[PDB]
Design a protein around this nucleic acid. Sequence first.
RNA 1: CUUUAAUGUUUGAUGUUCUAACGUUGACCCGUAAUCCGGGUUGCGGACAGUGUCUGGUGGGUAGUUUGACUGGGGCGGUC
RNA 2: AAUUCCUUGUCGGGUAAGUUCCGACCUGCACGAAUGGCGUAAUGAUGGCCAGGCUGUCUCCACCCGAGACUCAGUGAAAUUGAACUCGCUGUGAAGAUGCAGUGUACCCGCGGCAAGACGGAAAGACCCCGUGAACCUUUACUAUAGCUUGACACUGAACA
RNA 3: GCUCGCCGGAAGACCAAGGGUUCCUGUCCAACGUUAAUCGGGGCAGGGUGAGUCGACCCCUAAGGCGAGGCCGAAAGGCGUAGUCGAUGGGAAACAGGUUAAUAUUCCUGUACUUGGUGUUACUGCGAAGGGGGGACGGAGAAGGCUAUGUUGGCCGGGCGACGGUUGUCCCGGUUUAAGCGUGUAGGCUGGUUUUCCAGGCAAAUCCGGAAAAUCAAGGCUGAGGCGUGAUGACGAGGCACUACGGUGCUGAAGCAACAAAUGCCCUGCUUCCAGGAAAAGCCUCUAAGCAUCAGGUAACAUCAAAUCGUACCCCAAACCGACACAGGUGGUCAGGUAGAGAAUACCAAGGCGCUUGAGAGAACUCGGGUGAAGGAACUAGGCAAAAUGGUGCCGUAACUUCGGGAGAAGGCACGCUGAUAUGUAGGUGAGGUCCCUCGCGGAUGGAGCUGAAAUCAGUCGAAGAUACCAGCUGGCUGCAACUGUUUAUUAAAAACACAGCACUGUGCAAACACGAAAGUGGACGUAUACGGUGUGACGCCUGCCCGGUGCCGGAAGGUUAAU
RNA 4: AGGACCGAACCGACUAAUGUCGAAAAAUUAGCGGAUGACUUGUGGCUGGGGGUGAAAGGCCAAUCAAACCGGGAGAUAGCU
Lengths: 271, 46
Amino acid sequence: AVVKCKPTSPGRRHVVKVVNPELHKGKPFAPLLEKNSKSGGRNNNGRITTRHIGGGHKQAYRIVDFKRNKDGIPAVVERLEYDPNRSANIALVLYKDGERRYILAPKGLKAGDQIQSGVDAAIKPGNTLPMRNIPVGSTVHNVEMKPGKGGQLARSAGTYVQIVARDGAYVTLRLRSGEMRKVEADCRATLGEVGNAEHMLRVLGKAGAARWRGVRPTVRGTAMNPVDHPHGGGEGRNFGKHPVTPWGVQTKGKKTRSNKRTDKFIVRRRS
Amino acid sequence: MKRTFQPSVLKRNRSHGFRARMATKNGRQVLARRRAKGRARLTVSK
RNA sequence: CUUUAAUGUUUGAUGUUCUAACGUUGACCCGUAAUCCGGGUUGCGGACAGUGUCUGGUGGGUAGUUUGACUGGGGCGGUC
RNA sequence: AAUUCCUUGUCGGGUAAGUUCCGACCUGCACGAAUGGCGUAAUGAUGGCCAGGCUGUCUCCACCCGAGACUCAGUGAAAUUGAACUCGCUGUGAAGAUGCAGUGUACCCGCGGCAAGACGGAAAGACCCCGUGAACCUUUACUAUAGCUUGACACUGAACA
RNA sequence: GCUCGCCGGAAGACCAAGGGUUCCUGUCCAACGUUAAUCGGGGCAGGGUGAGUCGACCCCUAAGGCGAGGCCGAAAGGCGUAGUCGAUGGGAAACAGGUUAAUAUUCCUGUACUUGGUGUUACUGCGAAGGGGGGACGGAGAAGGCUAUGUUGGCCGGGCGACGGUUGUCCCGGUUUAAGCGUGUAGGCUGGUUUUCCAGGCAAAUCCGGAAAAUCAAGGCUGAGGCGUGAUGACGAGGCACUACGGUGCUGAAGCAACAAAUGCCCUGCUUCCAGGAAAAGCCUCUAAGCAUCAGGUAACAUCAAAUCGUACCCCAAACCGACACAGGUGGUCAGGUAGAGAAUACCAAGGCGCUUGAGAGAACUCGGGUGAAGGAACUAGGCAAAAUGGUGCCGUAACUUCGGGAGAAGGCACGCUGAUAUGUAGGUGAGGUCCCUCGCGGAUGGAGCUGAAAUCAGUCGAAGAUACCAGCUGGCUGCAACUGUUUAUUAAAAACACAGCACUGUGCAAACACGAAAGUGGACGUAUACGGUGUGACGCCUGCCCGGUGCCGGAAGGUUAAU
RNA sequence: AGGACCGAACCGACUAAUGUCGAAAAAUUAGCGGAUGACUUGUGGCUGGGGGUGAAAGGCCAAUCAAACCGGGAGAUAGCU
C-alpha cells in the first residue's frame, strides 16, 4: 500500500510508507537466524574501502535457501517475514517431512500455497526446477549461473528474467538490465517474479531516514579542497575539469568492464 | 577543561606493557636499547 | 606492362571442433567433531584467460625540479 | 540584483531631512535555465529595513549599595635594565634631542593621580623587495613513473577450413 | 560551647575509574600551607584493611587480537583455518542487629542459603566435543495492581510554658523491624491428555519437528505486593548509675490504622510501529560409540570442602586529569518537607560548611548592582547593552497556505483571603454489616471513616492579589537557504557542508570499485526496484540554441608508426 | 504519530561585560541553541604519517598539522646576519 503521509511536521511531509498487511508482526523463526556484523565499510586491513557506509540499525541474518536441494518433497508456505537484508520479502516454508526453510517470496504467492522442487513439478509460480525443463518464453527468478552453486540473477524485489531461446546446451536470458546472456542449461530457476513489487515507491522524506539504513552522508567533490579530490579548489563554485572519480578515472561515461573471460556468454550489453 | 591524559591502567599496559613489546619485532628492538643505557623502570609497569 | 581469374608457393590475419597444459571464488568425497588449504572423482571453461620479459600509446594518479636580469621599490611596458 | 563600474542612475512611496530600504523602469560595464532559472507556506542565536512598547543608550549626569584602589600588620612577585648628578624652548645634527649650542627656568625628597614623551615594554615586520632559500597546490611547463592498455616471444597442444 | 550565615537532585551520602597510606593515634613546627599556627592531606614513631554468599580469579562468549599447519611475500613479514584469548555482556548462594580511635553483607549475636566432594541407604540404564529446547533480547506509548515513602489520626512518653494568653479542637518526640521459609493472589502467556507412523535435526534418538486419529475441556508456566512465621526476639524515646566528666554501664513505654504516592517493582509483560531489533556456556532433555556383574543416574541422611587476590581513604575533589591545596575536567547509585505541573526555583530537614591573609578608612577611578525629575533612540557603524514582556482558565484572532500551519498571531477580562452553596461539594478511597461459597488473599451488596478539586454567590483588606523567586517583546516589508541537523577544539555557526528528491553514468557477479607487490578482505553472506561514481538540492512551474574546441562513445576507406 | 512544541538534567557555544604577567596556555558571569533523536554518554577495540579520518574547515590526528612525534643521515646547506 503506497500510503502518503500527513504533514504534521517538517520531514514527515514527503514520506511514503509501503504498509503491507500480508507480513507477520511476530518474532522470526529462531534457529534459522544468526549474527551479522556491520563492519562499517572497512576491510580486514582496516582502511575504509567503501565510503558512505556505516551506522544504521542492528539487523540479524536470515538463512535462506537458494540451491533448493529438496527435490520431490512438497512444501507448504507458513507465513511471510520481513527481512532487513533483502529488498524482497522472504517466506517461511514447511516441508512434508518436517524441515523448515526460507525462500524468496514470488508475486502471487500468499501463505497457503503449495510448492515443490524437482523435475516433475508443475510449471506454477513458486516451484524450482532445472532450466532444460522450463518452457522457453517463461518468467523465472533466482537463476543459478553455475549448476547447483547459487541462484544469483533476479533476486531484488519486483524483478524477473525472461527465458528466450534454447540451442541444445545453453539458454538465453533477457536480463533485467536489457542484457541477453547465455547460461548453462542445467541450472535451476524459480518461476514467477519476486514479490514486494512496490519497494521502488518508498521515498524517505527526511535526512535521518537514510542514516538508519546505514548510509552516511556523501560530500561532493567540488566541495573539498584540491588536495583531497581531483575536482576541489575554487574561489567559489569552480569546476573547470572533466568529471572524474576521487581517484582520477572519468565517471560521466567510461566503459570499465574488462573481463574477456565471461565475454563468451553474452550477446548484448546495456544498449 | 578535559586534558589530554585520562589514565586507564588496563589500557596503558595493553599498548606499552611488556608483552605488547615482546609480541612484535620492533618492540623487542626497543628493549634491546632500553637495557643498553640501563633503564631502571624498563617499561611502564605497576 | 595496366588489369584481372585460376594454379603453385611464401608470409600473416580470423573462424570452427577437440583436450591433455592451465583456470574453476560449481558439486561431492577424504585429511577432520574445520566455509582456510591440500588431496580425490566429476562437471563447466580451454589453448582463451591470466602471468613474466620486451615494446608503442595513455598517465598531474604520484614524484624530482624549472619558471632570467637591468629597473629611480616591484609588477606591467621597453631593453640585453 | 549578494551580480550595475559610471552612481547616491531615473521615477513612486517611506522621513522635516533617507549614499541604506520597498516598488517599478531596462541603459544587463559584466543575470540566465541541474556549476540550475524564477517562484515558494513553514522554519532561522541569518542579512537589510520600518513601527509599537520600553528604557540612563543619550541630552547631562546625580545619589546609594557592596568588591578592589587607599592606611596598618604578615608574607611577598614579575616583564624591562650600557651607565645616569634623567628641566622647558628655538636651533643644529644619521635630517622629530633629558644629554650639542644659545637661552630660560628650577631648594632636597616623598605620596596619590593622569598617561603627552622617553621614536615606552612585548614579538630578529607577517606588508614590501631581495635570496640563483623552502614548502605545498595547479596545469595541454620539462623529464620521469605506478596504473590502465597494444603487440612480440614464453607457459602453449592437436585437427580443420 | 553559645549564637549568626551558606548549600541542601548539593557545597549531602555511597561506589566504579584513577591514585597509593593521604585513613587513625601519640608526637614535633625548620622546610612545606601564598599570613600566624599550639593545627594539618607536612616531618616522625606506632597502629589500622579479616569474606563459601560483595568483587576479582573463574565457566561462557561480542567487537576484535594472537594464530599449529596452510596460502602469500627479496628479507623482516602479511593474511587466515583448527583453535586459543578478549567484558563494557550472560552464569550458584545472606540478611537484620551489635562492636573499633581506625574495618565490616568480612568480626560477633541471631536467623538462613548455594554448588561440589566423600560416605551410607534407596532404586534404576548411564553415557559425548553430537541433536534439540532453553538462555535470548528493539523503539514508542498506554495503563492497572503495588511498594519505597510521606502526611494525618490513634497510641505512648514528656511538657503546661522567661511578656499578653495556653489542661486542651494544646505543644515536643516516638510509633522501626530484613533475608529466608510457608502461602500463589492482582494480573500475563498457552487448549491439554494418551497411542501409532514418518524419507527432517551431516550417525542414532523415547527428545525436537511432522502427519493424523481418539479423549477432556482443563491443566501447566510466570508472577510484584499482601498475609503468616522469622520475632512473646531485636531495636527503641525516656530514665537509672557512673563520667578519664570522652562517654560507658544498666533496665527501658507505645511500636497501630487511614489516606497520598513514585521515573522504582509487576514488566525481559501488554498494545503498536517500522528502522525489524548479539553470541556461547551454565540449565533441561535426547541418544552415539562405550560399559551394560560393576560403573553412573536421581532421592534420602550424615559429614567434608568453598582455595587465592582485593577490602583502609579520597572519589564531582585540597588525594584523580589540569606544572599549584588551581573559580576548570570527570561515569553510575540514593533523592525527605512546604508551596510548585516539576529532579526548575525559594526557604528548610538529615547531613555538611563559612571558601588559609586579616584590621581600618569610606577620595578619584574600575568592576557588580539598586534608584531617578522631564525627554524617550535625539546614542551609535547598528536599539550593542540594559529596561520591558513573562503564569493559568475563558473569550478573541489577519495576509497567506503545501489546508498541517501561521498561532501563545495581535488583543482582551478574571485571580488575595473569609463565609455560604456543602458542620469541606463533585470525585477518589473503602471498614463494619448483610447475601453467595465451587467454602478464598473469593464474588455481590453495603456505605462508616479518611481524602477532597473546582465553580458560583456574599463579604472583605491593600496603592498593587499570576504579588517574592520563577517566567515569551510584538508587528510589518524584503535578501538568502526548503526544513531539524553539521562545521573551522583556541578570533569566522553562516548564505558554507549536509539533506530527502531528481538526473547522467559505470557495473551480469570471480561485478564495477577500493585496501593491498601478493594471498586475500570490503563491496555483499547483497544481485540491476542492486551497488559505485558525479552534479544539482524539499515542493510548484519549467529546464532554450550550440558537437567546432576538449573528453567520452562508436566506426572503419586511407595516411602514419614500436619491439620484431 | 512526530529528525513535532515549551522547558531542567545532559549536550552545545550566538551576544555582551569581565579577565589578558588571568582562578584558567580559552574560563567565569547575565542571557542563548538542541533537548525521543542524523541524540548524547561509559568501558573496550579498529584505522597512521604522503598515510589516516573528514555532514569538507585544509579541520583533526596527545596544548604541535598545507604533511605528527622521537632517534638517525648530520656538525645538511646558508653568496645572509
